[PDB]
């Protein structure tokens, strides 16, 4: 449970994070459906423990740059992501993105927009240069 | 003139503190946006003539050869589902602009 | 003045964890990129507004 896995229940091969379901499934109720008419839960055929399926963590990724002309240095914003989900993103569990020079951290800043990496958070306010969202912007400066 | 103004701002609060529906022009926008995403999630449940609406039911059953004829149906119907949504949103964005 | 900004992963909506679907969806060309270019243009405009 609580792991990105290729589960297979009664012939149904699926990718998701299995988790003990708090839903009060009735004895007859086998699988659990989400509003999207999708499988949000399922019954383990062997040991009866209703399982909530949730998809493995994802989001948009956005790259902030003073422009190639100014410099090659960039900062990365992980959309809608808490900082703790970037230590979770490890090559061991290969992600679509093969690159991972940002998981080195130390500058992982949390924006309401999402997890921002490679940009240094500061206390000074400025006019918005590159807009990140939820009141945050980024810029290339000394 | 000041007592009139102070009484007129008083009624403004009263009205907003009373009726449920005064911001109907703004709720509509929220209602339209949500309805379009809830309609787009409902499209996923449609077969479009495939043996199932679920790719895992097709892949687990039909072999790649028999599967592609079913997968293409789901691709064709979903692609339009997305195009419809994005055309509705591009038209609706011009109303908001 | 504005509306909800949305982004829609055309691969995850159309292909639910299906590489076969992906390799089939690639036969339509730029559609998915054009859809994201449209929704990004709507989303940038909500901040302009």
């Amino acid at each position: 449970k609580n792991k990105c896995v290729n589960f297979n229940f009664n012939g149904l091969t699926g990718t998701g994070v299995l988790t003990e379901s708090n839903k009060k499934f009735l004895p007859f109720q086998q699988f659990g459906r989400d509003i999207a008419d999708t499988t949000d839960a399922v019954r383990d055929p062997q040991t009866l423990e209703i399982l909530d399926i949730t998809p493995c963590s994802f989001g948009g990724v956005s790259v902030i740059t003073p422009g190639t002309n100014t410099s090659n240095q960039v900062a990365v914003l992980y959309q809608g992501v808490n900082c703790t989900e970037v230590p979770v993103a490890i090559h061991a569990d290969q992600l679509t993105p093969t690159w991972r020079v940002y998981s080195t951290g130390s500058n992982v800043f949390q924006t309401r927009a999402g997890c921002l990496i490679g940009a240094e958070h500061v206390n000074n306010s400025y006019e918005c240069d590159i807009p990140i969202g939820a009141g945050i912007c980024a810029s290339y400066q000394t | 003139i000041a007592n009139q103004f102070n009484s007129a701002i008083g009624k403004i609060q009263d009205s907003l503190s009373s009726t449920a529906s005064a911001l109907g022009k703004l709720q509509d926008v929220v209602n339209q946006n949500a309805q379009a995403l809830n309609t787009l999630v409902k499209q996923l449940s449609s077969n479009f003539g495939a043996i199932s609406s679920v790719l895992n039911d097709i892949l687990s059953r039909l072999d790649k050869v028999e599967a592609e004829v079913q997968i293409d149906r789901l691709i064709t119907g979903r692609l339009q589902s997305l195009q419809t949504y994005v055309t509705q949103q591009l038209i609706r964005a011009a109303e908001i602009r | 003045v504005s509306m909800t900004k949305t982004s829609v992963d055309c691969t995850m909506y159309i292909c639910g964890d299906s590489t076969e679907c992906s390799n089939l969806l690639l036969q339509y060309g730029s559609f998915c990129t054009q859809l994201n270019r449209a929704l990004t243009g709507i989303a940038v405009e909500q901040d302009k507004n």
Partner: peptide, 29 residues
């Protein structure tokens, strides 16, 4: 005005935040 969504996310449909927060809109106002 009061602003499903989780299921939409499970299907690649995400909402992005506005650049100006409701506090920044209230400071301009």
């Amino acid at each position: 005005v009061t602003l499903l969504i989780c299921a939409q996310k499970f299907n690649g449909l995400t909402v992005l935040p506005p650049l100006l927060t409701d506090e920044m809109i209230a400071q301009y106002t």
